[PDB]
From Swiss-Prot, chain C:
Protein name (record): Glutamate receptor ionotropic, NMDA 2B
UniProt-annotated site: Functional determinant of NMDA receptors, residues: N8
Modification after translation: Phosphorylated on tyrosine residues.
Residues of the full protein shown: 608 to 845 of 1482
Organism: Rattus norvegicus (Rat)
Known role: Component of N-methyl-D-aspartate (NMDA) receptors (NMDARs) that function as heterotetrameric, ligand-gated cation channels with high calcium permeability and voltage-dependent block by Mg(2+). Participates in synaptic plasticity for learning and memory formation by contributing to the long-term depression (LTD) of hippocampus membrane currents. Channel activation requires binding of the neurotransmitter L-glutamate to the GluN2 subunit, glycine or D-serine binding to the GluN1 subunit, plus membrane depolarization to eliminate channel inhibition by Mg(2+).
Lineage: Eukaryota, Metazoa, Chordata, Craniata, Vertebrata
Chain residues that bind L-glutamate: S83, T84, D125
Curated annotation (Swiss-Prot), chain E:
Full protein stretch here: 550 to 748 of 938
Family: Belongs to the glutamate-gated ion channel (TC 1.A.10.1) family. NR1/GRIN1 subfamily.
Gene this chain is encoded by: Grin1
Description of how the protein assembles with itself and partners: Heterotetramer; the NMDAR subunits are modular and harbor tiered domains that function in concert to regulate opening and closing of the cation-selective ion channel pore. Forms heterotetrameric channels composed of two GluN1/zeta subunits (GRIN1), and two identical GluN2/epsilon subunits (GRIN2A, GRIN2B, GRIN2C or GRIN2D) or GluN3 subunits (GRIN3A or GRIN3B) (in vitro). Can also form heterotetrameric channels that contain at least two GluN1 subunits and at least two different GluN2 subunits (or a combination of one GluN2 and one GluN3 subunits) (in vitro).
Name the record gives this protein: Glutamate receptor ionotropic, NMDA 1
Localization per record: Cell membrane; Postsynaptic cell membrane; Synaptic cell membrane; Postsynaptic density membrane
Tissue specificity annotation: Detected throughout the brain, in brain cortex, cerebellum, thalamus and olfactory bulb.
Glycosylation sites: N111
Species of provenance: Rattus norvegicus (Rat)
Topology feature Cytoplasmic, residues: 62-67
Amino acid sequence: DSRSNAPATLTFENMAGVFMLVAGGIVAGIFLIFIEIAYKRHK
Amino acid sequence: TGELFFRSGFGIGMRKDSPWKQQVSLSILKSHENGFMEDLDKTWVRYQECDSRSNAPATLTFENMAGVFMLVAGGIVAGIFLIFIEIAYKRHK
Amino acid sequence: LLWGLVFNNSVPVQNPKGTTSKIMVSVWAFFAVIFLASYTANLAAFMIQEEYVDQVSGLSDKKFQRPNDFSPPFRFGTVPNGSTERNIRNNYAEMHAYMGKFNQRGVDDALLSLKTGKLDAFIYDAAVLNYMAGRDEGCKLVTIGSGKVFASTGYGIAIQKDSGWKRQVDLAILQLFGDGEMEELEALWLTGICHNEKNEVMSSQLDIDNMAGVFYMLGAAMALSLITFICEHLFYWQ
Amino acid sequence: WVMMFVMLLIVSAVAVFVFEYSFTIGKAIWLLWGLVFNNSVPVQNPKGTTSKIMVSVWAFFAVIFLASYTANLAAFMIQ
Amino acid sequence: TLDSFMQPFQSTLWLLVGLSVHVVAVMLYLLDRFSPFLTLSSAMWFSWGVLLNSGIGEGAPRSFSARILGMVWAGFAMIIVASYTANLAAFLVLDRPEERITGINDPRLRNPSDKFIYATVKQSSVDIYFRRQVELSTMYRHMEKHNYESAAEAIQAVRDNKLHAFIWDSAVLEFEASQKCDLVT
Amino acid sequence: EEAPFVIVESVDPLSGTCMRNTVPCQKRIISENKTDEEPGYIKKCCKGFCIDILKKISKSVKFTYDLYLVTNGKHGKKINGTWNGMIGEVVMKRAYMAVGSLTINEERSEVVDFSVPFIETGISVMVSRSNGTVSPSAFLEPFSADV
Amino acid sequence: IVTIHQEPFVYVKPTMSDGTCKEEFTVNGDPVKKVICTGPNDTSPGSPRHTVPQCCYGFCIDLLIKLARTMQFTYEVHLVADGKFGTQERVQNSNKKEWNGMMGELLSGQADMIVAPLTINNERAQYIEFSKPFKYQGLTILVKKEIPRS
């Protein structure tokens, strides 16, 4: 016995975008830390 | 608003037997096939002084939101009263 | 501070040192939160009610009369060797000379061309188009309404010349209209399913031309910023 | 929920440890938690630049998260 | 049934907003470096922090034109976020489709079509009821080429997404729906 | 033959005749070219929109009828100062009546008579629905001008 | 000719003190062709039973103008006597049965043709002759519009 359920819940694969974006941000951040220590050693 | 129903057209009346009957019955067809009727329609009927699609959303007025204004006015007057109580408490200590 | 407190609290501010001023700015922040909530609610309610934007006037529109003196040239045509083609040739010479390029080969071919975007419009008989529109797959096709129709006529029943039977069949057809059987026949055989199809809202995806308003607002704000900078420099130079 | 929780933990730890060499792990977790709930509680910002980029990306993620949550919650109450 | 980032906004719009904030940063910087009486790095940090709502960076414009431009940029970011949230909510609340054919007089079921299939049990009362009705002659002619052997195979084929509609009595269908919570009449 | 008005079909193979709620139309068939063929009538079953009106007329006023399809080309044409098809058949009538998707104009009405039309038609435009818009000045729309 | 008063088709306006009605022009500037109208008084033929000369103009007016131009004849119009389209008037009246209104005036012999927005029905066309339709109007409903608000 279950009434009609109109709303749909959000899954995990549908929102993998933010996770991919933050992973790319972390790897770009470690690359930017390399560029940053390089620029610091330059000056 | 609504759908058409019992769509019957107008017509010119006359007696039971007359050549003017057939004359008009041919002249009306000639006018319809020529374009005179379209000009008459666009001139005397097609005024078109108002063309506006349906607008479902409703805008918020000012009287409907007077609540926040009343609340902030009460807050200001309570604040001046609180400044009186505050200077009183400061003078107390 | 009192301006930043209304736009979500994005720009840094400098808080006072008192207590009554703190209560005042707290009340103002509550007001700003209520304001933002109501604004967001009304904005979300607004975007869910836009649809049904398409209309043409008739055979006297600028699109038909002046194809070149407008946006990239519009397209409209039909098949040749027909009553409609002969009528539009005897009525609008230039329109026929223009539309002769887009002469189609049939009715279903023209419908497929319109569905694929190769043709922009279609000019044919009202009854067959209404039938093929009301009894088609989906309800994406629709006419421009009855409105004004050039060379308005009907489908009669040919009878031999000077036949007395015509008087009887005329009264018979009139009684058919008076009784309502003709309406039932038109609703059974002619009226499709899309006639009772309401408008379906959708999502516009927020293209660039939509934010043109805020873009022009930012441009005018930058212009006013430059104007005020020049004015302040002129006023402070002396 | 547990995905974003463990992701917050991993991001905070990696950020502080790698790009922080007074900014300990407690304040970092507090900041990375406050940045997801509209920015209501006070925080203590770092002094670096890559940590700033990391917390900016995290704030963008939190904004997207809040927008989607609010959208789904508004869609839920109408049915 | 939506996409994460680029569903409510266009990528070209994202690029336009990025170029806009990049230009606004330099415009806020110049207004102080070219006026009488702005740490381009801190100016760009402020311009990025106002849009992304992040609480990073400690810098405020000390001029008047720069100040009003920052106020306008904050308002622009606010209205952009508001429009984004509104469009996302609209698209997430207007994306709940459910056919749920009403019944026998449904337009999809009243007229035969290749995008909707339905069957029944051959050599039964349903066949007689469809053959005796003249209004449903087209539906009968369409369903004649899809009749099944019995209900045991038909119910199994329905759940296999091979069919789209099935007709039987009330008691048998209700019991099959109740004793197997997979389909609902 | 007209797709929305007069639809032609074949007899029922299970009975070799026409089904119910149909009118037996004798489709004229002329295929032999070397020699004129005997009266050629193929048992067909015609039905549609005008057929119902014709049946109701025959039920109202008492008369008998037997339809037969046109021979060549189309319903009406005035080439070489002469009519063909249905109108050309009506010229040398031999039928005394004509039905179908026929249009009314000046020439065909001056030649043959016409009754009251039972359906309206005319030149009509046909286009496809376009996706909606947002009224791009909507960023300041959901609010009054005084607030 | 006989004509009834309907604003979208047949406008009626009182003539000036000179004896005619002041001419005017359309939006583009074309001269609106009018014609003299000899009908009843302003309110009704009841108390002021007088024939005051007015002037009429409208769709049917210019249609009749074009028809008389192409047919090359002359005319003398006059308004309706009672103010009704036409219907059967069944009174006990053993030796009496006829039409009333404009249809009754036509059957009586007041005029020959009817240039007016008259409908077409079975009983109407049963007695008199009609022509091809020059308009197609189907009945409809009308409701008031109210602007929404919070």
